[PDB]
Design an enzyme around this catalytic site. Structure first.
Site: not given
Ligand SMILES: Nc1ncnc2c1ncn2[C@@H]1O[C@H](COP(=O)(O)OP(=O)(O)O)[C@@H](O)[C@H]1O
Ligand SMILES: [Mg+2]
Ligand SMILES: [Mg+2]
Ligand SMILES: OCc1ccc(Oc2ccccc2)nc1
Length: 265
Positions: A36, A86, A130
């Site tokens: 991320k 993942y 959340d």
């Molecule tokens: N470990 C992961 N494996 C697969 N997809 C992910 C993972 N983390 C996030 N995603 C995808 O990326 C998006 C955004 O991640 P998130 O951690 O919720 O970001 P934010 O904090 O900006 O909301 C998630 O809604 C999902 O679609």
């Molecule tokens: Mg966030």
């Molecule tokens: Mg999110």
């Protein structure tokens, strides 16, 4: 320790407000994971450095089968990088857009796995605040995993940060800026249980203003196809008064959950 050079980057997994998430492999172990990426300029402009710290601290220390692991972090003058477990089967959000509605068996299993993870959380007085389908991910056996711990805190608490996106999963006390505790997650559970069975959140509306109105007034209704048992559980969780909401044990042993769920407590 870790740096960008340690990874080959792959395909976009998703976008968030700040987060841009990518598939990645560690060069020396061939370990597959998710990376991320946050932009420091975006983080400073919005003033949410404190949320990123909380996400790293709370999520690296927790260990539960239904909670997504955070392994580490590093950063490089423009960007911050969280190193995540993942999740191969994607989000509950996508699965819901695919099928439109989940049957009763699928819905109660998800609700069980959530209540397990939440109960483990609340036991360290950690609250998520959340819970929504975009932040619920799916493991390789289809098991639900809670992610995105950016808004989480220790209880009790007030809100110090601006509510950015949707009001759809938030309880009255929280949108009205009042004080809140563990019971906010139980409200989120009830919103989600409704959305799984119906295909949309129970307070959904056209404008922010009106959504705000339906939530503080708790105006929702059931479509005919929602059974008596589901209505009973959802009505218990969507109470205006936090203290009248059930404890997680009550949810996990509610007759409709035990009858339809395919996982234990
Ligand atoms: N470990 C992961 N494996 C697969 N997809 C992910 C993972 N983390 C996030 N995603 C995808 O990326 C998006 C955004 O991640 P998130 O951690 O919720 O970001 P934010 O904090 O900006 O909301 C998630 O809604 C999902 O679609
Ligand atoms: Mg966030
Ligand atoms: Mg999110
Ligand atoms: O809790 C220790 C910790 C973990 C990650 C982290 O990331 C950054 C890095 C730069 C700016 C803001 C946040 N800062 C602290």
């Amino acid at each position: 320790q870790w740096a960008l050079e340690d990874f080959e980057i792959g395909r976009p997994l998703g976008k968030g407000k700040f987060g841009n998430v990518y598939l990645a492999r560690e060069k020396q172990s061939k370990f597959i994971l998710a990376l991320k990426v946050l932009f420091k300029a975006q983080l400073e402009k919005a003033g949410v450095e404190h949320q990123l710290r909380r996400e790293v601290e709370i999520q690296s220390h927790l260990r539960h089968p239904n909670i997504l692991r955070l392994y580490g972090y590093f950063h490089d003058a423009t960007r911050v990088y969280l190193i995540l477990e993942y999740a191969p089967l994607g989000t509950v959000y996508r699965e819901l857009q695919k099928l439109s509605k989940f049957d009763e068996q699928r819905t109660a299993t998800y609700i069980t796995e959530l209540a397990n993870a939440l109960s483990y959380c609340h036991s360290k007085r950690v609250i998520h605040r959340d819970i929504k389908p975009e932040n619920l991910l799916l493991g390789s056996a289809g098991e639900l995993k809670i992610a995105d711990f950016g808004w989480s805190v220790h209880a009790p608490s007030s809100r110090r940060t601006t509510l950015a996106g949707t009001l759809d999963y938030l309880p009255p006390e929280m949108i009205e800026g009042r004080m809140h505790d563990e019971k906010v997650d139980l409200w989120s559970l009830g919103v989600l249980c409704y959305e799984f069975l119906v295909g949309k959140p129970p307070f959904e509306a056209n404008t922010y203003q009106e959504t705000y109105k339906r939530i503080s007034r708790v105006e929702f209704t059931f479509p005919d196809f929602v059974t008596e048992g589901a209505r009973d559980l959802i009505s218990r969780l969507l109470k205006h008064n936090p203290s009248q909401r059930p404890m997680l044990r009550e949810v996990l042993e509610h007759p409709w959950i035990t009858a339809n769920s395919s996982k234990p407590s």
